[PDB]
Amino acid sequence: LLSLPLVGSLPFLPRHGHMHNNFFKLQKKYGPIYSVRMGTKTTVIVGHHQLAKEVLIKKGKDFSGRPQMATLDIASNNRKGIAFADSGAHWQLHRRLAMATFALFKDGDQKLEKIICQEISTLCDMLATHNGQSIDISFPVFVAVTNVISLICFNTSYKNGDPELNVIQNYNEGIIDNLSKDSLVDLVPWLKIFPNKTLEKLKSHVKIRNDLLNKILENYKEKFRSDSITNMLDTLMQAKMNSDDSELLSDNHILTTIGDIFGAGVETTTSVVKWTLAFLLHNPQVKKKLYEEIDQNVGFSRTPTISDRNRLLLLEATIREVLRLRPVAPMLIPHKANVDSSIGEFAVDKGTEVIINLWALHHNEKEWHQPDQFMPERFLNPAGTQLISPSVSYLPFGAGPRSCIGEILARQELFLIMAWLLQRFDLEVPDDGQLPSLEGIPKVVFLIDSFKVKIKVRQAWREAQA
Numbered sequence: 001l002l003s004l005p006l007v008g009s010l011p012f013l014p015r016h017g018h019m020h021n022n023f024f025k026l027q028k029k030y031g032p033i034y035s036v037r038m039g040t041k042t043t044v045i046v047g048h049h050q051l052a053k054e055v056l057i058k059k060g061k062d063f064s065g066r067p068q069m070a071t072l073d074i075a076s077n078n079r080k081g082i083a084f085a086d087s088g089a090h091w092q093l094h095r096r097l098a099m100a101t102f103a104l105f106k107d108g109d110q111k112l113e114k115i116i117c118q119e120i121s122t123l124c125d126m127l128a129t130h131n132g133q134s135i136d137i138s139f140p141v142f143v144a145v146t147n148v149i150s151l152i153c154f155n156t157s158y159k160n161g162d163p164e165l166n167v168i169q170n171y172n173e174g175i176i177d178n179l180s181k182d183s184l185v186d187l188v189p190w191l192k193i194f195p196n197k198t199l200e201k202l203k204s205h206v207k208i209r210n211d212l213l214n215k216i217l218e219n220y221k222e223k224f225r226s227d228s229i230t231n232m233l234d235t236l237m238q239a240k241m242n243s244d245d246s247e248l249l250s251d252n253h254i255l256t257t258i259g260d261i262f263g264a265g266v267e268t269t270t271s272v273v274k275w276t277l278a279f280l281l282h283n284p285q286v287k288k289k290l291y292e293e294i295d296q297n298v299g300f301s302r303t304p305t306i307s308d309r310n311r312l313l314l315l316e317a318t319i320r321e322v323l324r325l326r327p328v329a330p331m332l333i334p335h336k337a338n339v340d341s342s343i344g345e346f347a348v349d350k351g352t353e354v355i356i357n358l359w360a361l362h363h364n365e366k367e368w369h370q371p372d373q374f375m376p377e378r379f380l381n382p383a384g385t386q387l388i389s390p391s392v393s394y395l396p397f398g399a400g401p402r403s404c405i406g407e408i409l410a411r412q413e414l415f416l417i418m419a420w421l422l423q424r425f426d427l428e429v430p431d432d433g434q435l436p437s438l439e440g441i442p443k444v445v446f447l448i449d450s451f452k453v454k455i456k457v458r459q460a461w462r463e464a465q466a
């Protein structure tokens with residue numbers, strides 16, 4: 001009896017479980033590096049820190065490309081910007097000038113710590129109004145970080161109640177929802193197989209994004225002066241002015257680079273904040289030790305600062321642990337081989353897609369003690385006095401040419417937001433008793449389901465107000 005002709009084979013079902021965990025579970029059968037082919041495309045998935053550090057860092061330049069996808073073309077205005085732009089002159093110039101802009105907040109009256117705390121102060125005033133009520137804190141945080149990144153990009157902020165904030169939220173959500181059905185890695189290209197309206201819907205939200213930032217740019221060409229460079233749009237048009245490189249710095253190149261910075265600065269930081277609160281609702285013991293730590297190292301005399309990370313070490317460890325258990329990009333952003341090369345002595349051809357399964361690195365049982373569990377302690381020494389790097393299999397912000405350029409801002413935003421909130425607010429399960437689901441929702445970012453938290457002004461903070 002004969003065996004059937006096989007014209008197709010996939011190791012696991014499409015749309016069943018998170019794909020970063022489906023690739024991870026496949027390592028027990030096929031090892032830490034394997035490939036999948038779909039038509040002409042071959043994709044390599046890497047799930048061990050050694051091979052990952054080879055792709056990102058040792059041969060970083062060889063694998064610094066980004067694959068072309070119809071959906072990412074639209075959000076990037078055909079691969080301009082930074083994150084979805086391929087390797088080459090465009091990407092390298094704008095990333096540098098984007099990273100050069102962050103240097104401008106070293107110290108002064110426009111210090112990054114001072115810009116963060118200015119918006120956090122308004123945030124906590126708005127949250128204090130909800131004393132005794134259960135709310136979704138997504139939007140208040142969204143406003144806070146949106147103003148920070150808009151200050152870094154334009155030296156402008158939005159006043160309370162500005163409708164543009166709700167317009168931005170609407171398109172942010174619309175773009176994320178249509179950029180990918182689940183994570184960016186789609187095994188099967190469903191979008192070109194059946195009639196859908198995903199590209200059309202995505203174009204609609206991106207047009208609103210582009211139109212909104214185009215108007216801002218135009219208005220700013222009258223305000224720009226070469227003698228004053230204080231934000232990222234100043235930095236980039238300074239470059240355009242100076243090259244008089246020119247093709248690289250058109251208005252749509254400048255707009256798209258801002259769009260990447262605007263989008264990343266809001267959606268990542270807002271997301272990690274919600275994740276941390278969700279974990280603290282699930283672990284009151286860890287939550288209480290954070291209250292005890294901050295009362296003993298900062299008290300209520302003053303508000304937190306960036307220097308307090310030297311003594312708020314359980315807080316810094318808690319943030320580290322969320323970025324491990326629930327990485328913002330559990331499979332980073334897809335990489336591509338820019339030239340013929342090798343991974344683990346295995347051949348990888350030019351143009352091949354390469355994906356680092358950061359989820360596999362952060363949940364490897366040989367590199368981590370009980371990787372399923374939430375344990376900020378793992379990042380602290382046994383006496384709780386010094387922070388440690390317990391594992392070399394940890395790259396929350398990537399590494400190499402494609403590493404994250406907003407890491408510094410992110411770690412400051414995350415540390416200061418949770419410090420100010422823990423100082424001032426009790427953060428408890430709502431009256432219904434529902435705890436947030438920690439399963440997550442994989443999109444281009446690893447999001448959490450909306451949830452509510454009962455927020456109360458702490459008594460110890462009040463009593464210090466006399």
Ligand code: HEM
Pocket residue numbers: 082083084095260261262264265266268269272323327328329332333334396397398399401402403404405406407409410
């Ligand atoms: C917890 C906060 C954040 C995390 C965990 C995070 C993590 C990452 C990771 C893992 C990557 C990709 C690495 C790779 O593709 O190989 C990335 C890319 C990037 N991140 Fe972040 N990020 C965060 C916040 C931010 C912020 C606030 C910005 C502000 C601009 C930012 C800007 C970027 C950009 C521009 C890229 C693309 C880099 C490139 O393609 O060259 N990120 N992020």
Ligand SMILES: C[C@]12CCC(=O)C=C1CC[C@@H]1[C@@H]2CC[C@]2(C)C(c3cccnc3)=CC[C@@H]12
Pocket residue numbers: 075083171172173175176179209259260261262263264267268328329404444445
């Ligand atoms: C999709 C996105 C959000 C919605 C929006 O309205 C505008 C866009 C375009 C720019 C996108 C952004 C989301 C995050 C992106 C993908 C990314 C990233 C990913 C994970 C950690 N840090 C950074 C770099 C560029 C960013």
